[model samples]
Structures are given as C-alpha cells and as structure tokens.
Target: GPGSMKAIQAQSLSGPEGLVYTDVETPGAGPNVVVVDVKAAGVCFPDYLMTKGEYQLKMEPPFVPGIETAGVVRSAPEGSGIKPGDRVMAFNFIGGYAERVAVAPSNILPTPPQLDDAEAVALIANYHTMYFAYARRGQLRAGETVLVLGAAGGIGTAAIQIAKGMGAKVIAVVNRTAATEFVKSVGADIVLPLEEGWAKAVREATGGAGVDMVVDPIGAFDDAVRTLASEGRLLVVKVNRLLLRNASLIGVAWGEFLRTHADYLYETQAGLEKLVAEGMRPPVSARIPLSEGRQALQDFADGKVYGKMVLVP
Candidate 1:
C-alpha cells in the first residue's frame, strides 16, 4: 500500500504550538502487531508534558504524541485474539496521534459497547490509572469515605466514578461552581469547594472522624494529609503526616508500574469492562479534529480543559 496519512507530529521539542499537522506514510502490518485505523486519540496531561520534555518518560521529538487511541483494526497477525474490523482501544505510550498506528495485541482492549470511540480512548489513561490507584495500590474497600482532590479534572473525575463503582462514598473537592453539578452527575456523593477551611468541612462531612482514604491526584499532601482519618491511605504518584495521622502515603506511578507489570495494564480491561456494566463511562468533555490537536494540548496545559478531551482523525 503506497499511501500517506494525516498525523500530528511534534517536529521539535518546542511545546504544542510547534506541533505540525502533516502527511506521513501510513503504518503497515507488522510482524507481531495490529495496524489500527485510528478513529480518535486521547489528549492527556502526559501527552502535554511529553511535548515540553517534562514527563518522567521522555520521547525524542519528530514523533506522534498521543498515548491512548480507539479505532478499528485494519490488519492483524494470526492468532492475535483480534482481527480486522474489530472495535478496539490501545495504550501505545506514543504514536497514537496518527491516522493509523501499529500496536501490540497486549496493549489492546476490546472497546465495550457502552462507550463510543471518543469515550473509549478517554478511559485508557485516566480510568486505568485510577483503577490501579484505588484497587491495586490503595486497597480501597466498600463503605470507605474517599476524598477526591481536583475532582473536576480528568484524573479526579475518573477517580470519582471508579471509587463509586467500587462502593466507596466519594467526597469531591473542586473550585468551580460549574464542576459541582458535573461531579455529582458522575457519582460524587458530596461536593466541596476548593477554598479555605475546606479540610474542616471534610472532617465534618465524615462526622468528625475524617475520610478513610484520600485520592490526591494533584500533589496536595500538606492539605490532603489533614483530611485523612486514622489509618487512612493517601494515594498519589507525602510523608511525615504519616506519623502524625497514622495515614500511609501510597505511590501510584501507573507508567512506571506498567514497565515491570505490563500484564497489569491488560488486566484492567476486564475490570473496567465490569465497571462499565455498573454504569462507569469516561466523561469526554470535548472532541477536536486532528488538525486542531495542538490547541487541545495547549488548552490542557493551560488548565482550561475539564474531564477528558480527545482528537478525531
């Protein structure tokens, strides 16, 4: 197949503005990978950080930037568990910003019928990360009170939905009045403002006992530690507060964790699909054309995006 395809390429490490929407050769069948015709690609915080060379996992420029994608399989190797025309989502770590990508079968998940292309890709990073944080790392239990910091953004919103699906009572903390109803719609049991004395309100909401767990996607250890009850676990990517409050600071670096436990990434598909049956869906707030991919990353970098944003190619 002698053809070209459209893609968003980071031609240089000069931030999103320098990203070029240009033509490139379409990816072809690989020895052990599936070639996907990408329908949509997720715009995540890591995608933005990667552009500026600020993320822990660095990628040299002149590369596509999307980490998550959802599409139809165009080609596959024999006995790969999936075949052409199948609806799927994949986490490639990179190369998802193009019209087509070659992904390993291990990184692919069958997209649940409950989610569309945009929503399916949106779940790859945020939902998977939160699921790992709560279930595997934090050891969350039902009936526990969970305080979700930054409850308006992608990570926080995913945390809210997954925690509720896990039967935890979620208390969401957000700054905007607009996010109150949004967070509530996604299963936040209680919504608190991100203002002075909010920590006091958290304690009072739990009848002065404090929350049993705190999901701080943002680094708010100083404030987050104060909201935890005795023996509460704080999940993040914090410490002396541990001795003072009997709280444990648990690390949740999903990318780093995936390097050693790649199978864990694939395992989340079934777990998340089960949660989808329980009515969990990623909240895709915006869908931009691939031509406008740079702006999507810019908006996220500038803190202007809420929930999840995706790029349609």
Candidate 2:
C-alpha cells in the first residue's frame, strides 16, 4: 500500500499521443464510495473523442479517459451495498482507465456470473446505448427493418446485433468491404459497403417502403432520415427528423437518460442479461493491458479495430 499504481493520465487533451502511463498514488474509497481494483476497461468511441477534446462532454484535462470499467472491489463504505472482494463493474464518467478507480455507489454494478471482466466492461456503453436507442427511443418492433450506418464500429455493431436479436431485419452499412463480412458474422441480415446510393439501396431492398428504423452512430443525419418508413424511428446520440415521413428522431443519450432516471440502471442491466442469454454478445477483438490503452484508443480512431477492444490493468 506504500507504492504507486499505473494509470494513464491525460495532462493535456492534445491527443491520444500525449497520454502518459506513469506511477501515481493509489486510491481508496471515500464516503458513500468504493474503490475498485480495475481489471478491465472498455475502449469506446468517446474514449477516442476525449483524447482530442472533441467529445460532447468537455472536461479539463489531467484526468483519466475511460468511462466504463470492471474489476474487484478493494474497499467499500458501509451501507453502500458493496463489499471488499466483490466482482463489479462501474461507470465513473471518467477515471476508469487506471489500475484502480474510486466511484460512487450508484455507479457500481454487480458483475453477472456469465460475464468475464472484459465482457462485462464491454457491455457498459455500446450495448445499452443501442438498448435505449432502439427499444426505449425507437420503439423497435419485431418484423420491422433497421438500417445501421457505420455498422462496423463499436456502437454501430451493437445496434445491429441487438436489432436483429429483437427480430428486426437489419441492413448494415459498412464503410469498407473488409468489415462487411465481419458485420455479417455479427448477425446483420444484409451488409452493404458504404458509398453513394446506400439510402436508395435500402429503399429498393425494402420494395420502396423504406426501413422501419435507422441507427446512426456516425451521422449521415439527413440522409439517414430519408431511409425511414412512415412512423419509423431514427435513433442516434443527438439529431432531428420526421418532417417528410411520420418517423421520429430520438436521441440515444444514455448518460442523460441514466441521470434523469437513475433507477433505469436496473432495467438496463436486467434487460441486457436477457439479451446475453439469448446469445447477444460483443466481439472482443483485443484484450491489451493498460500500457496499450493509448494505442487501442488510437486504433479505434484510425478505424483499425475490427471489433471491440478492452484494456486490462
């Protein structure tokens, strides 16, 4: 307990290249909080966004960059419903890319028995973003059709898997031919390489009626809106649609949703467990240690990661 822990510190939001992995003081739980021995941390689009200071959630740097982590509890405040040695995952908003992290009780989630550290942490952001995006926001239904843009990426891929799992036919638009097969393997009913006329292709494939929903993780906001059928749904982080069609553009702001309805975590967790059991899962393309976190984030931004990546500490 006298020594230090390895943590990736962003002293500047200059870029991922500026991140430094160095020794710092170890952390401990504070009032109503628990300290986790971070085992695995997720590499997300937001993680890359934060590196360049381009994310929607702006923060003063000299901070950690990960939002989701899974590990064992090292210390917990009394009455916090967490105890030392518990296997848990936490959403700390930031400070998750280190060997250890301290988070509030409300942010801690008990790990499910079926998931390993990497898998548990992997589910934190992408899956639920799709969960809330498709189910809660889009009101996606069985026998409907869903079109996904940038479907080869983390959050985009999750939307495809979850949409297909929910009985929606999916047309995944991949930016390259190489990722098309990978997207298909993840259960996209149809995969199209991104290019001109993809929206037109979607309409023609559906016999000109258009898809019932469109998941836009990387926005083609206006073009994506054109593919939705009447009363269909358009789901993304932040946008507007529905002028020409009866479609509704819904924001899949998981952070704000969780903040407004904190209790929805249970609903989200419970909902994901069922999906997992039904074979809904993410592909862990790599499981590197914290020393490689900056590299992993860079790979994601460079579009080199084929699937999800995780950082173990």
Candidate 3:
C-alpha cells in the first residue's frame, strides 16, 4: 500500500475542472511521520477554494486537495507513540484526497472505534474551531442568542450544533429560503435569509435586542457586528467593526491557539467526544468518492450541495 495508491490531484489551476484523477506513489513513515490508510476525508470549503486558486495559501499544480481525513494508521515510528492498525484523524497542508497519507504525529489524532470514520472527519477542524471561538474567544454562555454567518456550510452547521449544545439560541443566516429548512435540520432554532437587511432580521428574531454572539466562519464581520447587542462578541477573520453596537470582533485563530501552546487539543477532543456521547453532531450532507474529489468541490462551488459533504476513499 505504500508503493502506489489512487489519488485525485490538482494538476492545474483551472479550478475543479483542471483536476486530474490518477495514481500516485504512496508515502512512507519516517521519524515523526505517520502513514494513514484513509477511510473518509472531509470535503471542506478550503478544498473548494483551493481549486480556483482563490485562497491565500496558493499551491503549484499537481497536488492533492483535502485538509482533514480519517483512517487507520498503516505505519509509524516505534517511539512515535502511534502504531499500525490505529484509527486516526489527520490534518496536513494537503494530500488527503488519496488512499494513503503520511503526516506528522502532531497532525494525526487518535479516533476511537465508536467515532466512525464519517463522524471522525466531521468533528475535527470545523466543530473544534467553533468550540474554541464560542467558549474560549467569544465567552459564549447559555441562554445567549447566536447568529451564524454561513448556516448551510460545514462550519456554519457546526456553529449551530455547538451553540445549541451550550443551551444557546441559534439564528442561522443562509443565502436563500431554500437553504432555510436545510440549516434548520442541523439544529438552528431560527433561520434568516441573507440579504441587504439580514442583520435586521436577526435583530427582530432576538426581540429587537440583537444577538449576544456571532459565530462567523464566513467574513460577514460587518453584518455580524452591526446587529450585536451591547458588549456582544463577534468571531471572525481580519476586520474592524464600527463599534456602534458595542460589539467586539474576536479573531479565532484555531491553529495558532494550539500551535503556540503544548496542549495539543486533547481537551477539545475530549469535549467533542462528550458532545458525541450526548448524541449531538454536525450531519453529513453528502458523500463523494475520493476519485471524484474535484467534482465534489465543483458541486459545492456551484451550490449543488449543502451542509457537510464527506469524501470516502
């Protein structure tokens, strides 16, 4: 299995259409590397963005196109504390759209048998990032009203679940009424159509008092800050909010949060496991074969899918 494997490669920068389906040399484990026999890889928004060369992290042609994936470990260094036949979820710069992946020990997380491959992929980057944004950065509390920017996407649905799990009311802002029912199925208490006055809709839903927190995976920071009640928190990327509503835009750099510290996300992992035990999780909207990874991203780009789509290898 370490010799060759099927892989979907971004051979060009023409978006998904330029992706090449073919075989690749399987990677081997050395030192801190852990080779994973992939079962399921998350079809994240980054995969879609990476296709069009739109994301900040640009790449040369001929590379794999997935960030998070779950599988069984095929090999590991003896002192790495990981071994063959271990179930794990892996994160890396790329190379997840393949049957095997060699990643660093820090990038591979142990996944219990109970957390099936599908469940394992859905819980990692999206859910845990939202958890950090809500609990650590936003200081979100129970009974608070939260407005999610991308209610129909992967992190959007994750934010909805995490907010509701914390006993908070969730207001989902989707692009259209059609995606309304879709977001609602993911545990959003109220769904609002994103338009010129979407923030107004959110304010009214909270009884004209404005929402207490905004879990913004999308950069709708201006819209989010505009409707925040006094002293409310907004989680987002680089942006400056007009301070009119007494809202604070808190940056949720999940990577840096863990990278600088030695915690290694075990606490977050345990918390997610608890949530899973309680029977709450972000739903898988669709499954695409690993061979058709580019098509899956194109479908997502064209809005032909919703919620979280997973790639099965």
Candidate 4:
C-alpha cells in the first residue's frame, strides 16, 4: 500500500474528455480478496463513459475507471487456488486502471493457457458478454444465422467469433469500408457495410427471409426487427437501441449480473474459458501502455477502433 503506482483516474466527472493520470497507492491483499499485478486491462466503451460519470456504474470523483483486467495474482485468500504468481483475469468493480489492484476471490479467473496478457484481457470481458448474450440469453442453436450490428467493435467482434464457434453463420455489419477485411478475418460469414439503406442490403443478402437472430449492440433494433425471420429473436445488450418488430428483445448486462448473482458470473467466466480453449481468440487491435490510457478511451469514443483494446501497466 505504500508503493506508488500510476493510474488513470477521473478527478472530476467533467468527461472522458477531462480524465487524467495520477499516482495512487498500490493496493494490497485484503480478506477474501486477491491482489493482482495487472499486466493488462481491457479498454471498453463503458470504461470510457465511466471516466465521465455517464455510465450505469456510478462512482465518486478521483476513482480509477477500468472494469476488467488480466494479470498474475500477487496474493489471494486461503483455499482459493489463486495463489501468488498465478496468471489470471478478474472483473474489478472499480479501480482497475493501475499497475496493481485487489478483487474478490470469486472474481478471479485463471488466464487460459498459451494466451498472453493482451489476448486474455481482450477475450475475457467481450467473450463472456457474448456467451451470456447468445448461449444463455438468446439460446442460439447450431446452424442458426446471427446478424450482428456494430460487428467491428469489441462486443461485435466477440459475438462474431462466438457465433462461429457455436456453428452459426454470422453477418457482421460495420459502417466503414476499412473494417471489411478485419470483419472477414474474424470468420464472419458475411460483412455488410453500415450505410444508408443497409437494411435492404441485409434483406437481399439473407434471401429476403431475414436472419434467424439479430445481435444488436448498436441502436439499430428497428432495422434488426425488420430483418428477423419468423420466430427470430433480437437480443439487445444496450438500452440505447430500440426494437420495432415482433421479434423478442432480450436484455443482457453482464456487469450488473456479476454484482447480483455470483454464481452466474462464475458460470459465464468458466464458459468463456472453455470457448477460449476451444480456439476462440478475441482480436485486440490496440495495445497501449497505461500512461496512454486516455488515448485508448479517445479512440473508443471516436468510433474508429476495429477491435478490442488493452492497456499494459
């Protein structure tokens, strides 16, 4: 606790536009908590909003804003099996943008074998979110077709891979032409440019019947509803989006779920680990040092990042 470490802290909720880096005390182990020497932390849109106090997880000023991290365990509670020096990942409630931080025992998950810090951080949050969205919420079946909006961002990329791994055909939609190749590289069966009248393109691509399910993180629920087949379900992970059809819209908030049901969080993490072992690697397009964490957030806000970003400390 006496050691000083650099952290990206929001001294004021002015905005992600005003977040700053500062030195903070390195966290130490607490009862039922494990101290992680954070090797990498995932950059998320929520984290970007958290810095500005615009996210659902409200926090006071002068707080670190990252929600997920991957690193080696420096200390853990007795009998937890997350001993010192064990490679692991954890979903910290707050204060993850630092070189070291403490988390609950149940939050600790072993980093999958052969995966580096960046890859592990990139995969854990997005993959778990998609797993909870599709496997648990959507009840996706093999051979079903999945149409994903914002399919080039963090959650989108993970959804594409998880859908593919589940033996489903995936159609990834991105607004920019530059992301077409990246979307295809992630195993998307089809990539559609997010342009005016893209709904017609999707309709044409799906043979006029529509897809089996729509996974929309963008606010394109109306278009997604128009593109769903009979009995097709639309899973809405973000409330910013609205649905305008007969398709069912299932809401998924993995962060809130983790706080409400410990068992569900455990199961989601375990499920994602299995998927990773089965060769599901979420792509990470940016790896910036912790000092440049603000830049990562800026990139996220700019809506130009093609994949997940991880900040090393």
lDDT of 4 by residue, 1-313 (tens): 3778899888888766666778988887687889998999988877887777888778888889888899998889889877898999888768778989888888788888868888988876788889888878899999998998888988889889989988999988887778999999999998988778887788788898888898888775566677888778888773424444556777888777766776886677677777778988778888888898777778778887888888888
Tens digits of per-residue lDDT for model 1, 1-313: 6589999999888889879999988887877989898999999888888888887788898889988999999988889889899999988878889999888888888999998999899889999999999889998999999999989899998999999999999999987667788888888999999888998899999999999888887774577788889998888744464344577888788888988998887677788999998788888889999999988888888777778988999
lDDT assessment of candidate 1:
0.87
Error of 3 at 97 (Å): 0.1
- Superposition-based RMSD of candidate 2 using all C-alpha atoms, in angstroms: 1.9
Q: Would you list the C-alpha lDDT of every candidate in the order shown?
A: 0.87, 0.83, 0.82, 0.83
- In model 4, the runs with Cα more than 4 Å from the true position are 238-246
Per-model TM against the reference? 0.95, 0.94, 0.93, 0.93
Q: For each of the candidates, give the backbone clash count.
A: 0, 0, 0, 0
Candidate 4 accuracy as TM-score: 0.93
The reply for model 1, stretches above 4 Å from the true place, is: none
Write candidate 3's Cα lDDT for 1-313 as tens digits.
5477898999888898988779998887687789999999888777777877887689787889889989999889887788899889999878988999889888878885566787788877898788778777888899998888878887888888988888899988987578888888888898888888888888888889998888776675676787889988877726574564566768788877877863748777777777777777568878889877777878888876676788888
Could you say which candidate leads in lDDT? 1
lDDT of candidate 2 over 1-313, digit per residue (tens): 6567898888788878878888777776578779999999998888777888898888778878899999999999888878999999888778888999888889888887788898888888988778878778778889999998888888887888888888889999888678878998999888887778888888888999998888887765677888888887777754454355577777678888888899888887888888888877678788987987778777777788766788888
Q: Which ten-residue region of model 4 has the weakest summed lDDT?
A: 238-247
User: C-alpha displacement of 185 in model 1, angstroms?
Assistant: 1.8
